[PDB]
Amino acid sequence: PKVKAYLSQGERFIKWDDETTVASPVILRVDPKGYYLYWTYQSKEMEFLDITSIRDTRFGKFAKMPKSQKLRDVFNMDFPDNSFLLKTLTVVSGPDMVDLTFHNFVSYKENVGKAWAEDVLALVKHPLTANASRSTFLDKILVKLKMQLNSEGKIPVKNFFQMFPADRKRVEAALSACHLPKGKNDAINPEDFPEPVYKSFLMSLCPRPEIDEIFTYMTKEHLTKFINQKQRQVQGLIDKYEPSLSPEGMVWFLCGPENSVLAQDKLLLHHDMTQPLNHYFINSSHNTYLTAGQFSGLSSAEMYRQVLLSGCRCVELDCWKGKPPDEEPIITHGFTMTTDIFFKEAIEAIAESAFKTSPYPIILSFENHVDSPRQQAKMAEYCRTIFGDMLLTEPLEKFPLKPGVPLPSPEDLRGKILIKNKKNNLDEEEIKKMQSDEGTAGLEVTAYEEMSSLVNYIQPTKFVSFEFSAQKNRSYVISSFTELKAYDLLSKASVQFVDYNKRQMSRIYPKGTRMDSSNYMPQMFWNAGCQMVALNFQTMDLPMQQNMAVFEFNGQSGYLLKHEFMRRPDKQFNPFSVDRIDVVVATTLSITVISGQFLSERSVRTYVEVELFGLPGDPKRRYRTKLSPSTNSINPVWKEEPFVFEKILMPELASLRVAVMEEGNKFLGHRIIPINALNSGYHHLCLHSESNMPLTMPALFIFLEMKD
Ligand SMILES: [Ca+2]
């Protein structure tokens, strides 16, 4: 995705901060490679923001507004017919959904911020941007080093120490090996640090003798043999990667884009999007308005923006009456100490962000406690007016709400918002039981005409039995279960649950005892064909690590087509009891964890954990490498046998977790990858954060092999 020329040429803005009240003129740019959004002050200083760190961009009325009187005067915000809203730009960045930074800009020229917002987000959100080769992430480092210059236009040696902080002596030695100065207060001409010199620097700092071991120099014939035998035109690869094929040439080849750990086409939108809505796994958030714990902490409408921007397609609104003297509907976790937001604010947030990154339909799960015709009427009017044409207010002509009629497809409902709401306890012991399980979901109130009229394809009803649901044969009825109730059902009525999910929707949500907003592991519910397995997006624990990872695929649309046997009515499937037909494309996966590079910002021992998520009958062994030989985190090499996952039964449903840890089990980076997206051979596995964001420094070198 090429960086448009105007972005690299730059535009004039005033950058402002509310906490400091400082407003400074800047030129804003994206570098030609699209690694950094950066701004340059009049005094020549620069600040950089990784493109991969950007979560959203906002223009006009959606941008952040200056709150201090000092800044309001500067921007003439107390004036009739001012052009301030034609000048505002906000860039939102952060390592997860909650820890957000707002970078705020006001353009000198009118209207330019719209293009900046749209084009920058397009670069950030392209499924391939985060999935570049190891070489690209290494290049990102080089570009930073060469752009962050001192007063004399030179690279301070201290910037090398900051970039590679684990071992100063080794950095000094690598600079010296390149005939560059290594003095603490020395500086380097950027002209003396082109790509080949950078490569030499890396080879000195981070030697790769484990790659030299594959040479058992290469010619055309020998390298062709390697590519055809191990990795599952050759002279052109030598010309591209050989510095003078040498060991170093092989290093760069193996770090290059010709070698991809993923079948990258699978990151793009590519699933059949024309099947009934309930034939997909749907990315789903629980108690979306909460930023932290379930019992206390801030509620924020910003959570709706954040989850929707990551392709979440099902969110939750817990609606309550205003607290007298207030008479305006609010969103909060009832009977707790969580803060309140206005219902209106949530609708405004959803309307803004709903289709920015995915065009496919969203479902709003209302948990309604507003036992007021007036306040329900306000709720319904907010939805109708703010969502406008986005709101699905009536069923589609092709899909009437009658027995035997399937749900419409994601494609049939492109750009539509669907409302899930009802459509037309007392003592200490009972309270405790409810709090431990369904929580406030056990306390919903009757819907009146205004709210009822908005409900069509997602009608919640009390579950009776799978037999009863099958008899009634209504695809437009949804059943919701706590993790506890659904576990009881999937354990005791597995086949019936899968069959239910071929016709109707189920939504799963965390039990009430999880007051710290911990998550349950989603796999067992996906295994039963459950579509909306709702998790707390503010908690990037293992469940969310998996959720973010698997939903990155299919364009981060928030929809993944379920396995054929979870869809077609003529093949009964039981995830606990596979048959001959189920296992037709079973595979055995071997992964060898060979070595790691720049794994930590400090010298500490490290190890790698590997496991598989999948069916009950899938291989359950969890592997760990030994600790690294020493506290060397620059280039540890392990001496491990392949980790074998024998008979992955239905690879489409399985994912491989590879997680890198410091001694003590402190997270450094990970990947969770659907089995069918993996390429075989020697690869440099670039590591992601808990929230699946690409990390620049750390990588693993691995060998993958798959057999029938
Ligand atoms: Ca709720």
Side-chain angles (χ1 to χ4, degrees), residues 91-115:
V91 179
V92 187
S93 66
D96 55 41
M97 313 270 159
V98 182
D99 184 21
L100 306 180
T101 301
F102 300 89
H103 311 271
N104 302 312
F105 303 91
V106 179
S107 65
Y108 286 85
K109 295 181 183 189
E110 293 176 2
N111 306 310
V112 293
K114 184 174 183 291

Side-chain angles (χ1 to χ4, degrees), residues 286-287 289 316 318 367 440:
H286 173 247
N287 273 355
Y289 57 91
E316 184 166 3
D318 288 3
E367 191 196 294
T440 57

Side-chain angles (χ1 to χ4, degrees), residues 240-251:
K240 187 183 181 179
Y241 289 113
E242 179 60 29
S244 184
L245 192 78
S246 65
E248 189 185 340
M250 178 66 86
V251 175

Side-chain angles (χ1 to χ4, degrees), residues 394-412:
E394 68 184 5
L396 304 173
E397 203 151 25
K398 187 180 171 181
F399 299 93
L401 303 172
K402 297 297 188 193
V405 184
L407 283 168
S409 74
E411 205 59 66
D412 295 328

Side-chain angles (χ1 to χ4, degrees), residues 291-398:
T291 67
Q294 298 291 301
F295 184 77
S296 60
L298 181 73
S299 297
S300 177
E302 181 60 40
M303 292 307 302
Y304 294 99
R305 302 194 184 89
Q306 292 302 134
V307 309
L308 290 165
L309 286 157
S310 280
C312 183
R313 297 289 89 179
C314 185
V315 298
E316 184 166 3
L317 297 73
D318 288 3
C319 310
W320 299 82
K321 293 188 306 302
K323 292 168 184 175
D326 303 343
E327 307 297 338
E328 180 76 24
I330 58 171
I331 290 167
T332 192
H333 196 186
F335 301 106
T336 75
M337 298 182 174
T338 61
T339 75
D340 308 341
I341 64 171
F342 288 116
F343 177 88
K344 185 183 186 183
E345 203 198 359
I347 303 306
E348 291 172 334
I350 296 163
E352 178 190 346
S353 307
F355 305 112
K356 292 189 76 177
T357 67
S358 172
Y360 293 102
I362 68 169
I363 296 160
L364 312 186
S365 182
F366 281 46
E367 191 196 294
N368 185 33
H369 302 273
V370 183
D371 62 329
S372 161
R374 180 185 159 268
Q375 290 181 56
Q376 281 193 31
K378 294 177 117 283
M379 288 165 62
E381 187 176 305
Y382 284 138
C383 293
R384 289 190 181 264
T385 58
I386 298 169
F387 292 144
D389 290 349
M390 292 187 297
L391 187 61
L392 194 79
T393 55
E394 68 184 5
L396 304 173
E397 203 151 25
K398 187 180 171 181

Side-chain angles (χ1 to χ4, degrees), residues 232-247:
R232 188 174 276 105
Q233 287 179 331
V234 177
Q235 177 53 223
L237 293 170
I238 298 170
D239 289 327
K240 187 183 181 179
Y241 289 113
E242 179 60 29
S244 184
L245 192 78
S246 65

Side-chain angles (χ1 to χ4, degrees), residues 69 134 247 313 450 580 624 667:
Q69 190 63 237
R134 178 56 167 166
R313 297 289 89 179
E450 287 79 6
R580 292 204 178 273
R624 285 184 176 184
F667 183 98

